[PDB]
Amino acid sequence: YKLICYYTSWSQYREGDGSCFPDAIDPFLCTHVIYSFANISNNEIDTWEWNDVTLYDTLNTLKNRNPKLKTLLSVGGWNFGPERFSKIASKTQSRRTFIKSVPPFLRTHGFDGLDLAWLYPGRRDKRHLTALVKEMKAEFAREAQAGTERLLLSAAVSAGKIAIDRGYDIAQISRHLDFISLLTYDFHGAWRQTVGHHSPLFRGNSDASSRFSNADYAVSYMLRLGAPANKLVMGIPTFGRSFTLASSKTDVGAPISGPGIPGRFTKEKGILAYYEICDFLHGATTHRFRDQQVPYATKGNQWVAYDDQESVKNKARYLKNRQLAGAMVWALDLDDFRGTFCGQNLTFPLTSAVKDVLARV
Numbered sequence: 359y360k361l362i363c364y365y366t367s368w369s370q371y372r373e374g375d376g377s378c379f380p381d382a383i384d385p386f387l388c389t390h391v392i393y394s395f396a397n398i399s400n401n402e403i404d405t406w407e408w409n410d411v412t413l414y415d416t417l418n419t420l421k422n423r424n425p426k427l428k429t430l431l432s433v434g435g436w437n438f439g440p441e442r443f444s445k446i447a448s449k450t451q452s453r454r455t456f457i458k459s460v461p462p463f464l465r466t467h468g469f470d471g472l473d474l475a476w477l478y479p480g481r482r483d484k485r486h487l488t489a490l491v492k493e494m495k496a497e498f499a500r501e502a503q504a505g506t507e508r509l510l511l512s513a514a515v516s517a518g519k520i521a522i523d524r525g526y527d528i529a530q531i532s533r534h535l536d537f538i539s540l541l542t543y544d545f546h547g548a549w550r551q552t553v554g555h556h557s558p559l560f561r562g563n564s565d566a567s568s569r570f571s572n573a574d575y576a577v578s579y580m581l582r583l584g585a586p587a588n589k590l591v592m593g594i595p596t597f598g599r600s601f602t603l604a605s606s607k608t609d610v611g612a613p614i615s616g617p618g619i620p621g622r623f624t625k626e627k628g629i630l631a632y633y634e635i636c637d638f639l640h641g642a643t644t645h646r647f648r649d650q651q652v653p654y655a656t657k658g659n660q661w662v663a664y665d666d667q668e669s670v671k672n673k674a675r676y677l678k679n680r681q682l683a684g685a686m687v688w689a690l691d692l693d694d695f696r697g698t699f700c701g702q703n704l705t706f707p708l709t710s711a712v713k714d715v716l717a718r719v
Contacts, residue, residue, distance in 0.1 A: 359716040360684030362512075362539060362591055363388035363709065364432070365417065367395055367407050369691035375698065376623025376631075378691040380417035385424040387709055391690070392473050393417055395435035398442070401452045402459040403433065403472075411467065418468040430510060431464065432473035440483075443476045447486035457494050461501045464509055471510025471536065478516055479525030488527045495534040510536045517542045517576035517593070522583070529584035538585060539686040542573040543595040546663070551614040555663040556599040558650030559673055564610060565649075572650065573673065577680060590682045594673055596693040596708050598630045598664030608656050610647070618660050624692075631692040632708055635664050636700035667711040674715035685712050 369378045383391065393414065397406040405411065414431075421427045434443055446452050460472060472494070479487045495511050502508035513531065516522060517540050532538065546554035558572045569575060573592060581587060600618025607613060617628030624631050630638065635655075642657035651672055654663045665673075677685055687693070687709050697705035704710055 359678075360390060360537065360591060361388045361709070361713055361716060362390040362392065362537070362684060362686040363690045364392045364394050364686070364688050365690045366692075367393065367410070367413065370407075370409075370413070372623050372625075374623060375696055378695055380413055380420065382695045383417070383420060383690060384705060385420040385427055387706060387713060388687075388690070389426070389684075390428050390430060391417065391420070392430045392432050393469075394432050395438065395475070396431050396433050397438070398433065398446065398456065401446055401455045403456065403463045414467045414469075421468075428470040428510065429468070430471040430473045430512065431467075431469050432475045432514070434475040434477060436477055438475075438477065440477055440479065444480070444483055444486070447476075447483065447490045450489070453486075453490060453493070457490075457497050460494070461497065461509060465506075469509075470507070471512060473512045473514060473539075475514040477514075478521055481524050483525050484527050487525060488530045491531045491534045512537050512539060514539045514541060517544065517573070519570035519575075519579060522579070528580060532585040532589055535589060537589050537591050537683055538580075539591045540573075540576060540580065540593050541688075542576055542593045543688065545571040546599065551604075551616070553601055553603075553610070553612040553614055553654075553661050553663075555647060555650060555652045555654060557595050557663075557665060558647065558652055559669070559676065560650050562647060562649040573676070577682070581680075587681050588683045591684045591686045592673065592677050592682055593686045593688055594670060594712060595665055596632050596687050596689040598632070598635050598662045600628055600630050600663075601661045603656070603659040603661050608643075608645075608661070612661070614661075618662065630662065630664070631689070632664070633692075633694040633696075633699040635662060636694065638662065665708070667707060670708055670711045671715045674712045678716070685716065687712060 498509045543557035546556045601614045604613045604615035621630045621634035642655040644655045646653045652669045693706045693708045694700045
């Protein structure tokens, strides 16, 4: 079993305890740590944060205590316009330059692979996403001729039936990728104004519409589409999605005025770190949808959909019963990395839960 953990570059500038550096990562927790978001300039892979080469180096020292630890660098991400990604992939010349630029960079900073986070290829991209993956992978094969270990190549994909059908050739790209990380936590879209869990596990018997909105469907659709189970990794959120209620209606369906107020450390609207949710829970009412088997909480006019140790193991068990290659935890830095906010003196409680379940056969 693989446990693929993302570390976000910008969580270093979080005030107080919110601040997190590669430093705080238990090197025996995950099997793969992905440094999140490199950039691209002059069609070449490149850094993003000033001190990136330091943090790179820091993260890669962990491989000193755990010699089996593998690290990868992700390209793209959320503040990386996909158009920009598009433009580099469609011109075979700008595409070949970017590819050639990748191995030496990874080799210099000590990475073991590349993660591609093109955040959503459009209808016009499918052809090129396939080209990029096919060739990039071909370059990694030729470079291992130098006598060194072959670099890994992974991809972060959307779990929305439409986004998939629209921009991905799943049968084609599964043969070239070492593993595919499914983003099974973007289900209640940014769009609507109605309360709902962003990462429901199941179909929720109390919902006949957009049933293509849960991890369960997303997975069977990907297996159906032709991706093999031993390359599939299911994404597990270590955060919550918040909303400011527009009325005292709390239950399923309730209306919404907009996103919830910022987390005190997180400082971003509509999102909350698990450690922020732990402090939020005090004096909050907790409910759990049994249909989707996921929790949520209200307090004042704040409704929060999130995942706890239980919902998280649950997903991990499922993942095993279907025999996927592993789990992916978005935000090692959004978990209780200090272990000082959520009662128990455990560090990274959420990612531990997953790992605990992934280790019992």
